[PDB]
Enzyme design. Structure first.
Site, mmCIF file in Angstrom:
data_model
loop_
_atom_site.group_PDB
_atom_site.id
_atom_site.type_symbol
_atom_site.label_atom_id
_atom_site.label_comp_id
_atom_site.label_asym_id
_atom_site.label_seq_id
_atom_site.Cartn_x
_atom_site.Cartn_y
_atom_site.Cartn_z
ATOM 1 N N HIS A 1 7.211 -48.683 29.034
ATOM 2 C CA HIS A 1 7.364 -48.880 27.605
ATOM 3 C C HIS A 1 8.744 -48.525 27.067
ATOM 4 C CE1 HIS A 1 6.320 -44.603 27.556
ATOM 5 N NE2 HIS A 1 6.852 -44.572 26.345
HETATM 6 C C1 LIG Z 1 11.974 -40.919 28.346
HETATM 7 C C2 LIG Z 1 11.625 -40.136 27.093
HETATM 8 O O1 LIG Z 1 12.497 -39.721 26.281
HETATM 9 N N1 LIG Z 1 10.323 -39.911 26.898
HETATM 10 C C3 LIG Z 1 9.801 -39.097 25.783
HETATM 11 C C4 LIG Z 1 8.439 -39.594 25.307
HETATM 12 O O2 LIG Z 1 7.422 -39.286 26.252
HETATM 13 P P1 LIG Z 1 6.807 -40.309 27.297
HETATM 14 O O3 LIG Z 1 7.930 -41.260 27.725
HETATM 15 O O4 LIG Z 1 6.237 -39.462 28.392
HETATM 16 O O5 LIG Z 1 5.785 -41.226 26.441
HETATM 17 P P2 LIG Z 1 4.373 -41.684 27.037
HETATM 18 O O6 LIG Z 1 4.354 -42.169 28.427
HETATM 19 O O7 LIG Z 1 3.794 -42.640 26.006
HETATM 20 O O8 LIG Z 1 3.524 -40.322 27.067
HETATM 21 C C5 LIG Z 1 3.144 -39.723 28.314
HETATM 22 C C6 LIG Z 1 1.751 -39.158 28.142
HETATM 23 O O9 LIG Z 1 0.789 -40.203 27.768
HETATM 24 C C7 LIG Z 1 -0.305 -40.151 28.650
HETATM 25 N N2 LIG Z 1 -0.845 -41.510 28.777
HETATM 26 C C8 LIG Z 1 -0.106 -42.594 29.142
HETATM 27 C C9 LIG Z 1 -0.631 -43.802 29.213
HETATM 28 C C10 LIG Z 1 -1.905 -44.007 28.937
HETATM 29 O O10 LIG Z 1 -2.436 -45.166 28.995
HETATM 30 N N3 LIG Z 1 -2.711 -42.941 28.639
HETATM 31 C C11 LIG Z 1 -2.230 -41.693 28.527
HETATM 32 O O11 LIG Z 1 -2.962 -40.715 28.190
HETATM 33 C C12 LIG Z 1 0.208 -39.539 29.918
HETATM 34 O O12 LIG Z 1 -0.835 -38.922 30.688
HETATM 35 C C13 LIG Z 1 1.262 -38.550 29.446
HETATM 36 O O13 LIG Z 1 0.737 -37.170 29.274
HETATM 37 O O14 LIG Z 1 8.179 -38.951 24.110
HETATM 38 C C14 LIG Z 1 7.905 -37.545 24.291
HETATM 39 C C15 LIG Z 1 7.673 -36.846 22.964
HETATM 40 O O15 LIG Z 1 8.480 -37.066 22.027
HETATM 41 O O16 LIG Z 1 6.727 -35.989 22.858
HETATM 42 C C16 LIG Z 1 9.101 -36.827 24.936
HETATM 43 O O17 LIG Z 1 8.663 -35.525 25.346
HETATM 44 C C17 LIG Z 1 9.666 -37.590 26.101
HETATM 45 N N4 LIG Z 1 10.877 -36.914 26.612
HETATM 46 C C18 LIG Z 1 11.038 -36.731 27.992
HETATM 47 C C19 LIG Z 1 12.420 -36.298 28.351
HETATM 48 O O18 LIG Z 1 10.202 -36.985 28.889
HETATM 49 O O1 LIG Z 2 -0.235 -47.348 17.513
HETATM 50 C C1 LIG Z 2 0.731 -48.084 17.711
HETATM 51 C C2 LIG Z 2 2.092 -47.656 17.799
HETATM 52 C C3 LIG Z 2 3.059 -48.560 17.993
HETATM 53 N N1 LIG Z 2 2.780 -49.898 18.127
HETATM 54 C C4 LIG Z 2 3.846 -50.886 18.320
HETATM 55 O O2 LIG Z 2 4.861 -50.293 19.104
HETATM 56 C C5 LIG Z 2 6.122 -50.402 18.399
HETATM 57 C C6 LIG Z 2 7.009 -49.263 18.794
HETATM 58 O O3 LIG Z 2 6.515 -48.095 18.115
HETATM 59 P P1 LIG Z 2 7.498 -46.846 17.892
HETATM 60 O O4 LIG Z 2 8.638 -47.301 17.027
HETATM 61 O O5 LIG Z 2 6.708 -45.644 17.526
HETATM 62 O O6 LIG Z 2 8.028 -46.603 19.400
HETATM 63 P P2 LIG Z 2 7.310 -46.438 20.847
HETATM 64 O O7 LIG Z 2 5.850 -46.151 20.550
HETATM 65 O O8 LIG Z 2 7.465 -47.741 21.616
HETATM 66 O O9 LIG Z 2 8.036 -45.286 21.547
HETATM 67 C C7 LIG Z 2 5.696 -50.405 16.928
HETATM 68 O O10 LIG Z 2 6.768 -50.924 16.162
HETATM 69 C C8 LIG Z 2 4.467 -51.316 16.990
HETATM 70 O O11 LIG Z 2 4.783 -52.688 17.093
HETATM 71 C C9 LIG Z 2 1.501 -50.396 18.019
HETATM 72 O O12 LIG Z 2 1.247 -51.587 18.145
HETATM 73 N N2 LIG Z 2 0.535 -49.444 17.844
HETATM 74 CL CL LIG Z 3 2.757 -46.640 28.465
#
Ligand SMILES: CC(=O)N[C@H]1[C@@H](OP(=O)(O)OP(=O)(O)OC[C@H]2O[C@@H](n3ccc(=O)[nH]c3=O)[C@H](O)[C@@H]2O)O[C@H](C(=O)O)[C@@H](O)[C@@H]1NC(C)=O
Ligand SMILES: O=c1ccn([C@@H]2O[C@H](COP(=O)(O)OP(=O)(O)O)[C@@H](O)[C@H]2O)c(=O)[nH]1
Ligand SMILES: [Cl-]
Ligand SMILES: CC(=O)N[C@H]1[C@@H](OP(=O)(O)OP(=O)(O)OC[C@H]2O[C@@H](n3ccc(=O)[nH]c3=O)[C@H](O)[C@@H]2O)O[C@H](C(=O)O)[C@@H](O)[C@@H]1NC(C)=O
Ligand SMILES: O=c1ccn([C@@H]2O[C@H](COP(=O)(O)OP(=O)(O)O)[C@@H](O)[C@H]2O)c(=O)[nH]1
Ligand SMILES: [Cl-]
Lengths: 360, 362
Positions: free
Chosen positions: B207
């Site tokens: 993503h």
């Molecule tokens: C690359 C980047 O900047 N990333 C920042 C980003 O996090 P992230 O990239 O990990 O987003 P994301 O993958 O949506 O979530 C993962 C979780 O979703 C769970 N997860 C994932 C997929 C799913 O279907 N179900 C589910 O439960 C997983 O099990 C898992 O626990 O936003 C975070 C925030 O501001 O707090 C920052 O701490 C991060 N900074 C860092 C440095 O990792």
């Molecule tokens: O519950 C949600 C959150 C986000 N979005 C879509 O994901 C885009 C990106 O959201 P955001 O700016 O929070 O960044 P990201 O979730 O990709 O880190 C939004 O503009 C929406 O089009 C969505 O469909 N559902």
């Molecule tokens: Cl994801």
């Protein structure tokens, strides 16, 4: 062909941009776009600067002002971004350290537009101050850092910003003083209108939040200036916020006991500064301009970002703790002076900046 | 005795807040206020975490999301300032590095309300990432910096942040995994549902903006996952931004060539990660979680903030330049393992954080 977009919101930014804008104007293959955030809106805080300093009309006026930090910054962020999306500039230039500066920088970095900070790296080392947060966050968001002083350069290195993004260019407000001095001379009749004698008064400006939001500090300052006035007239263009606060706390009568004025344009200001026997201020720009004209300065603060003025003995800190102490400090310092020394560059800070941009 | 207001917006922030909030609730002389910015709003991105991770409903829902950086950040800044002027908390806690994080810090700092940053000091050294900006500026706006790694501590010291505002507490996402792992095992039926066995698949999430906002980069990823799928089933919970980009670009048909799902909840995610033969992701949290369960990871990015995973050989970067190469990399790393090493602390980062917030002093 390079597009340089300048974000300005406040009086001191109008004055900085007037110097940089002039140079970018007559630079081949540069178009400048100028965005006025609306932060300063009153004619005596904004329009008089565009007139007297011959500043092209802004391409945008966002008309955002007079709100909270959150409101002003938040709205500026959305509005500036909208303009950046339309104009797609090559560079965004932000100036100084207001909410306007920070909103400009942050709007731009999220769009992958290079940001350059005019007047970079100044530090009060008091992070409770909104202006310090604005300086730190702007510096850390910028790609280029145009430092006016060696201290400012050292402050940036100490916070991990690489050498190769820092250029010591001197101070654009010195450029402005140089360029507009003649015009001030031939257009300003303020000594006349005020019945002042050259070197027959002290000049004061006071508007720091920490001096005007705190009743007891503000009272110490207005009491001190009225005392000083007994000895030597005090001319005091009063910032609108300062004037609001003094009225609100019941201190309005002190303003009546000195020669208090509404805010003045840059040309009058130059004439009042030049001709003053001494300048009392809590303004960044005014403490430098004092030094421009070799007029001894008292800075009504616990620190300054412009430390070289203290070292060169041109400027002196007097925190507003005691009205009599501060009064006597002002009166004593008006028969002092500082060492011979050139600070702030040769008056071509604006072309050093022009050059570094059209290269990088 | 002390009021601590959390600002959350996105899925990974709810998981982090779950872990910290549990502790803060146990603590005497600590009242919490939770502000949900509205950044993530779909139930499978917001509500499901509140419910399964046992988080109380937000005190405020600002309902901001779906706009530009400008719009989201700007409106969040004004909105959050309003709440803070009502609640007047003693601390504001911000998490991670979304637009929500930054708006929370900026709101607070200009009101002279102390900000603590949970997950502080991480650096990609790539400013084109909005997330890099968000964590640099958040860090510089914070009075307390809760760093998960030594790298993060060193990153902060290098940017002139004093040692006394930095604490290496480990990672609250390890606390989360540890605390919710029994519940996931007890309740999740995802493997049954999809018809997967342990070690019979690869898990994918994608993503990042730099991976989804570029048509041909995204094609590289989706095509690579299609290829991998021919040799080992690929399970792909698809982020709404990613699905939307895939649709608009006309790449939807690639998601049919794998086991594409809507976003799953934390409990189902644990079971998917735990039982995967390999995880391929551009997620921050998923990288660490892959190591928590000792599953090889491939990060589909030009860099990671989580560099210790590369050095321990649990993770491997594979920038999406070429579909065949990314596929081959994925399949090759499936057979690898990292070195035994403890990272991210002892599973009580939240407790360390609570302790510092309470004893820091006026
Ligand atoms: C690359 C980047 O900047 N990333 C920042 C980003 O996090 P992230 O990239 O990990 O987003 P994301 O993958 O949506 O979530 C993962 C979780 O979703 C769970 N997860 C994932 C997929 C799913 O279907 N179900 C589910 O439960 C997983 O099990 C898992 O626990 O936003 C975070 C925030 O501001 O707090 C920052 O701490 C991060 N900074 C860092 C440095 O990792
Ligand atoms: O519950 C949600 C959150 C986000 N979005 C879509 O994901 C885009 C990106 O959201 P955001 O700016 O929070 O960044 P990201 O979730 O990709 O880190 C939004 O503009 C929406 O089009 C969505 O469909 N559902
Ligand atoms: Cl994801
Ligand atoms: C302390 C602080 O943060 N200050 C920051 C602040 O500036 P500042 O304190 O100088 O505000 P200010 O005194 O209103 O303007 C002076 C000018 O107005 C003229 N001036 C003054 C009074 C008057 O009646 N008429 C007039 O023309 C004077 O002739 C003079 O040219 O905003 C600036 C900006 O963002 O660019 C930052 O660069 C500053 N940062 C620094 C570090 O000095
Ligand atoms: O044209 C103007 C500009 C400012 N102000 C007053 O000055 C205050 C401080 O404004 P400024 O933009 O300087 O805020 P700062 O940069 O000091 O945060 C405003 O709320 C107004 O009351 C005003 O009356 N007229
Ligand atoms: Cl003033």
């Amino acid at each position: 062909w390079v597009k340089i977009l300048s974000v300005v919101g406040a009086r001191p930014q109008f004055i900085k941009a007037a110097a940089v804008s002039r140079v970018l104007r007559a630079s081949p293959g540069v178009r400048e776009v100028l965005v006025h955030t609306g932060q300063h809106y009153d004619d005596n805080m904004s329009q008089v600067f565009f007139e007297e300093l011959e500043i092209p009309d802004p391409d945008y006026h966002l008309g955002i002002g007079g709100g909270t930090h959150g409101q002003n910054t938040g709205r500026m962020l959305e509005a500036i971004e909208g303009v950046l999306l339309k104009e797609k500039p090559d560079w965004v230039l932000v100036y100084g350290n207001t909410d306007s500066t920070l909103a400009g920088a942050l709007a731009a970095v999220k769009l992958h537009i290079p940001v350059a900070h005019v007047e970079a790296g100044l530090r009060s080392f008091n992070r409770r101050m909104p202006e310090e947060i604005n300086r730190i966050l702007t510096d850390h968001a910028s790609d280029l850092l145009f430092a006016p002083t060696e201290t400012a350069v050292q402050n940036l290195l100490r916070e991990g910003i690489p050498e190769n993004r820092i250029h010591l260019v001197g101070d654009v407000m010195y450029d402005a003083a140089l360029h507009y001095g003649a015009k001030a001379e031939r257009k300003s009749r303020i000594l006349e209108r005020l019945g002042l004698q050259a070197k027959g008064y002290v000049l004061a400006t006071i508007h720091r939040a920490e001096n005007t939001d705190d009743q007891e500090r503000l009272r110490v300052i207005l009491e001190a200036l009225a005392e000083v006035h007994q000895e030597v007239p005090v001319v005091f263009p009063v910032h609108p916020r300062t004037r609001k606060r003094a009225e609100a706390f019941g201190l309005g009568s002190y303003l009546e006991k000195v020669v208090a004025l509404e805010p003045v344009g840059y040309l009058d200001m130059v004439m009042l500064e030049k001709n003053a026997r001494l300048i009392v201020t809590d303004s960044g720009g005014v403490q430098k301009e004092a030094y421009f004209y070799r007029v001894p300065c008292v800075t009504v603060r616990e620190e300054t970002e412009w430390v070289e003025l203290l070292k060169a003995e041109w400027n002196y800190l007097a925190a507003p703790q005691n009205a009599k102490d501060l009064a006597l400090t002002i009166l004593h310092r008006m028969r002092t002076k500082g060492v011979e020394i050139d600070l702030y560059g040769d008056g071509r800070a604006s072309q050093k900046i022009s050059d570094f941009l059209r290269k990088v």
